[model samples]
Target: FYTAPSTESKFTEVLSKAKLQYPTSTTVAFADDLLDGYAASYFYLTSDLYMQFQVAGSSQRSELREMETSGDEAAWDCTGSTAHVASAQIAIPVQEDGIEEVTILQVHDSDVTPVLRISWVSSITIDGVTSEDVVLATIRNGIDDSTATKTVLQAHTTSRTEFNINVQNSKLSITVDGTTELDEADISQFDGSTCYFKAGAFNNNPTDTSANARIKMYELEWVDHH
Candidate 1:
């Protein structure tokens, strides 16, 4: 179902679902442990169970944390339908200058950038008014180009947000907080692309030592309709 980081510098098969990826700077041998602002653990808050992910801004590119569906397997082509569903809260720290942005979800393939990326931005200045928001960026012309079509999904806050991404019938559909954001939007531009789902806190400011990002995942799952 999932794999946990072990002392052998590789993931070890575990009973839990979804494989975790954490900063390489972490000296901890287990995913349930925390070190240097990096952690991936299943904990309880209130009456619900949640998976918490944290990554420090100063971490290197190899040190970012994420959970990916691609574990011990090759990427899947877009011929069949795939769905990724999750409910989570992105906790932005009070000192948010360096922690400008963090990636929360992704549809990834072999390219340098993912096919789809949902990010939480701490500040966006429009007409000199700064605002926090969540945005979605999708690459339509395959992985050859690094640019993506960006759209603002909703305002950002420390609230549990529910979202779903479904790829079916050569189209992409997205729902955020029970509202339809994209209804069967054409994704045929990525016809031959292979991809998988990823979630967690991926800090955007790798060079800023004071930057940090965290996410509490209440629910996460993937479904393949073949």
Candidate 2:
């Protein structure tokens, strides 16, 4: 059961600067755990302080992944205080024995010098064969989509740079920084029949690693066919 969090002490650190102008949180039963299972969660905020979420690690309710923004747009709490994995892999299902599509509202660090790598895989294999898997994109890593040595999707860095497209089987559109790389890749040779969508990486720190790019993204767009 969810009651008003124990007291101010529990979330004080969260809403420290801002006064709890209103009841940011409501009383709900099992609402916390129930909410996490969902794709995403929203937060209510105030002036002096804003509502913060826990980190997106191990499904614990302690990490502050996102917070409420001032206006309509959902602003990520990528204030450099957090470090998200390269990409929050979004799994897409394949309906036929052909191609599929996947889209995500992804985020990447603009401050860091990291590059993003968007990749995908068909299904998990075993001993050179395939396995009746529960997770399709977990066999190996994802498909490598970065060509500039780093497939860093240009998120907030520029107005563009946030899209990687597989136009039909003869072309690829990697949009970034007022430019788009419309090339014909060997994407047609890949095995994308049964499953669609795989994990991707939005890496920023290319080398030794200092401040990695914390990406914030949404749903992705992809197509599946035979």
Candidate 3:
């Protein structure tokens, strides 16, 4: 259940009630003032979990909220999805950090392993080629997206982009924009596993600058292939 914040104090009240108890090392349950199906079921913080604010010459400012990018505002299932296709459309504004990186969207398992990830980095070195302003469309087998074991469906420039991860039989079909890359790859590992999406700015620039990396969500959706 949730109550809409009509005033600034009401919003502050909700935030105050959302404070974490002990257990800074892991996630635990928190308040429920957020819209149903969109509120995160768990919470944690060493210093910050919902929003990691950093100062100049320090770390990157990162934040995470579990709301979907569509008309359906409900709490998201942290477990993986059973739908045939899990897709999302995200917008990434330009970043000024030379060595900074950002994760705009991620679909990960309950174990926190990424099942699918859409990310924008300052630059990435893949296949001995370094590309700037890159968007990584990746799928993994219980591992991080950067590992060579993961399938990199495409590596296009960061901007407004759409992603489709379709599950049919024992393979996955990945589509970006209108192009179908890695349209047929074995993905039986995710057959009945649970997963959920996390969207925010997971920036990782340690440089001491005031310019912050950012991302704007456009829309997120899913469909059944059965």
State the displacement of the C-alpha of residue 3, model 2, in Å, after optimal TM-score superposition.
Answer: 17
State the lDDT of candidate 2 residue by residue for 34-109, as single tens digits.
2332122322222322222211211112212122222122222322222222212122222122211111222222
Better of 2 and 3 by TM-score: 3
Please tell me which predicted candidate would have the highest lDDT against the true structure.
1
Question: How many clashing pairs in candidate 1?
Answer: 1
Model 1 misplaced stretches (Cα beyond 4 Å): 1-15, 24-48, 58-71, 79-95, 124-131
Ranking by lDDT: 1, 3, 2
**Candidate 2: C-alpha lDDT:** 0.25
Better model by TM-score: candidate 1 vs candidate 2: 1
Instruction: Tell how far residue 161 is off in model 1, in angstroms.
Output: 1.2
Positional deviation of residue 206's Cα in model 3 after best superposition, in angstroms: 4.7
Backbone clash total for model 3 is: 12
Q: Write the per-residue lDDT of candidate 1 for residues 31-138, one digit (tens) a residue.
A: 343221222332112223344556675532222233333433335665456543333333433334566677777776645547676777755554465566555544
Q: Between 1 and 3, whose lDDT is larger? A: 1
TM-score of each: 0.68, 0.28, 0.56
